[PDB]
Structure formats: structure tokens, C-alpha cells
């Protein structure tokens, strides 16, 4: 199997280490699960201690969070936008953590309309007072407002698809969003 020990590599002095013992189960490795965008497929691989790991081979409809108002919604994935570790992985659309992706912004738009009340890009006195007593913080950044109009939201994944079997993350804003757009603008 895939070995994970340090006994096979050379020492810090450069000398290789002679064989000491055979491969052991408690230091094994497994084939990487290059999950891609598609219909859900989750495998339940047995793990040391009698536990189970959710191997993901294709994921969709992840859970992404909007930190400006502290909300989280189930939004569908589209494709990988930019993977810092390797341009090959984003090119082939493989889902990992810290890999920017595109998600549907419509659930965020409808939630914003139902919460704040005011229209974006334009009776019921209780609804009026609820939507007028929470004003002030209704202003939203233009850099991400453009992507809201474009219908696709840039998001970064924090969960590990190959370990927990889930696709969770949050969308970017501020300097975190600006740095990635600046890096990826010449690329596209």
C-alpha cells in the first residue's frame, strides 16, 4: 500500500536508511479522491478505530456562508474558479479546500430581499416598521454587488471534500476577495 512513514527517505545527513521492517497498517496511505462537480456520490470507507470516512467522488449543492449578515445557505456549485496549489486542479474542476468556486447567488438575493426589504438595483405596516428599524447597514460593497448582478458568487471552500464528504465554505469579501480577483484577472 501507499506508505506514509519517514523510514524510506534519506536521513538529514543525506545517507539513505537500510530496510528495518515491512510496511505497517498503522502508517498506510490511500489513493487521493479527486472529487469533481456532478451528482452526489458518497462512499463510506472503513477507518482505523472502527470509524467511517465519507469519500466524496462528485459533489453538488454545497453549504456556503455570507459573513456580512451572518447567514448560511445551501447553494449549488458551478465550477472551480482558482486553486492556488495547482492550476491543473482548477482547470479540471476538482473540489478541495481553499479553492475558489462559483455558486448561485439567487438564494442570497431572495434572503436579502426578505430580510432587509429594500429592493436591489431598482400596506403591511408591521413589515414596513420591521424593514425600516433595521436600516443603516443596508449598504453593500460594489465589488461583490457586480458578482451578485452577474448571478454567480465567488466562494472559498473551508471543508475537506475527501475527508468529511461535504462541500462547505464561505464567500469572499474585503481584501480577501480583492487579492484573489487581482491575482486571477490576468489569468482569465
Amino acid at each position: 500500500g501507499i506508505t506514509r512513514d519517514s523510514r524510506h527517505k534519506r536521513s538529514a545527513t543525506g545517507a539513505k536508511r537500510a530496510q528495518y521492517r515491512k510496511k505497517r497498517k498503522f502508517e498506510l496511505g490511500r489513493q487521493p479522491s479527486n472529487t469533481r462537480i456532478g451528482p452526489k456520490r458518497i462512499h463510506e470507507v472503513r477507518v482505523r478505530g472502527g470509524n467511517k470516512k465519507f469519500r466524496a467522488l462528485r459533489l453538488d449543492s454545497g453549504n456556503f456562508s455570507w459573513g456580512s449578515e451572518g447567514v448560511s445557505k445551501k447553494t449549488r456549485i458551478i465550477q472551480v474558479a482558482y486553486h492556488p496549489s495547482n492550476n491543473e486542479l482548477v482547470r479540471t474542476n476538482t473540489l478541495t479546500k481553499s479553492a475558489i468556486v462559483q455558486i448561485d447567488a439567487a438564494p442570497f438575493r431572495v434572503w436579502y430581499e426578505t430580510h432587509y426589504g429594500i429592493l436591489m438595483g431598482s400596506k403591511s405596516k408591521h413589515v414596513q416598521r420591521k424593514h425600516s428599524a433595521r436600516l443603516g447597514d443596508s449598504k453593500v460593497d460594489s465589488a461583490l454587488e457586480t458578482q451578485f448582478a452577474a448571478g454567480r458568487l465567488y466562494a472559498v471552500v473551508s471543508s475537506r471534500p475527501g475527508q468529511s464528504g461535504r462541500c462547505d465554505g464561505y464567500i469572499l469579501e474585503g481584501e480577501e476577495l480583492h487579492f484573489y480577483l487581482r491575482r486571477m484577472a490576468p489569468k482569465k
Binding site: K9, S85, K139, E173, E176, R183
Partner: protein
């Protein structure tokens, strides 16, 4: 070593679980006291680097043995080599002999390290195949 832009990698460098919003100007800076009497440097308190592998403003913890050595090779990024000098006793001749062993440690940007610069380090879990220590105190040869 040299203060460059903190965004010098292919990814975005940010402190985990540190958030920015509108009601509060940007966000906060997180730091912890490594304990055992070592004080967090003021540069770490008010700085800009990330250094996930740093005893301060990071996630590694100092526990185990605390050692002191002299810098011999600081030609690696955020990592230096220190030399420990000690006398080994040979019972047959009832005498001693010089023995040395090189130790690799990780260094925060809050410390400026050159040749000499007696550094006190503490065990902070393996970092990459050789580095199990982090520099906590510096005795500068110039000050």
C-alpha cells in the same frame, strides 16, 4: 528576514477564524502568550505577518524541552540552524571532549536573527521533518 509584502504566495494569507465586518472597523489581531515566562514581543502584538508556524499569532504551542544555542546557519526562510556545544565525559580517561550537534528551529519575523545571536528555543511539535523547536528569546550580540 526582510520585511516584504505579506501576500507573497499563490494563496491569500489570513489568520484562521479572524473575521472582518462593517459594524466594526475591519477585524482584530489575535495573539497568545506562550507561557513559561516568555513575553510576547511588541512587534508580534502590532505586526502584519501571518506565520501559521509561529508560537505567537499562530496555532503551534510550546511544550516539552527548552534549549539554548547559537545561530550557525540562518540561510533559510523563517528557519535557522543552531549549534549546541557541550562536553562529553569519557570515564576511562576521567576527562572531557567537545561534542556538538546542529538543531533546526523556526523563527518568527518579530525576531531579527544573524550569526551569533544566542537564541533560546522551545519544543513546538514537528514542523518539517527536522524542526521541532521555535525561537522564543533572543540574546543579541549588538544590543
Amino acid at each position: 528576514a526582510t520585511e516584504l509584502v505579506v501576500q507573497s504566495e499563490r494563496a491569500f494569507q489570513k489568520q484562521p477564524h479572524i473575521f472582518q465586518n462593517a459594524k466594526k472597523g475591519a477585524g482584530r489581531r489575535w495573539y497568545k502568550d506562550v507561557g513559561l515566562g516568555f513575553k510576547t514581543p511588541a512587534e508580534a502584538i502590532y505586526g502584519e505577518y501571518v506565520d501559521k508556524k509561529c508560537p505567537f499569532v499562530g496555532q503551534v504551542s510550546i511544550r516539552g524541552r527548552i534549549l539554548t544555542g547559537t545561530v550557525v546557519s540562518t540561510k533559510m526562510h523563517r528557519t535557522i540552524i543552531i549549534r549546541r556545544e557541550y562536553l562529553h565525559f569519557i570515564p576511562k580517561y576521567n576527562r572531557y571532549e567537545k561534542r556538538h550537534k546542529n538543531l533546526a528551529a523556526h523563527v518568527s519575523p518579530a525576531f531579527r536573527i544573524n550569526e551569533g545571536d544566542v537564541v533560546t528555543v522551545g519544543q513546538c511539535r514537528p514542523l518539517s521533518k527536522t524542526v521541532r523547536f521555535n525561537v522564543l528569546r533572543v540574546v543579541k550580540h549588538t544590543e
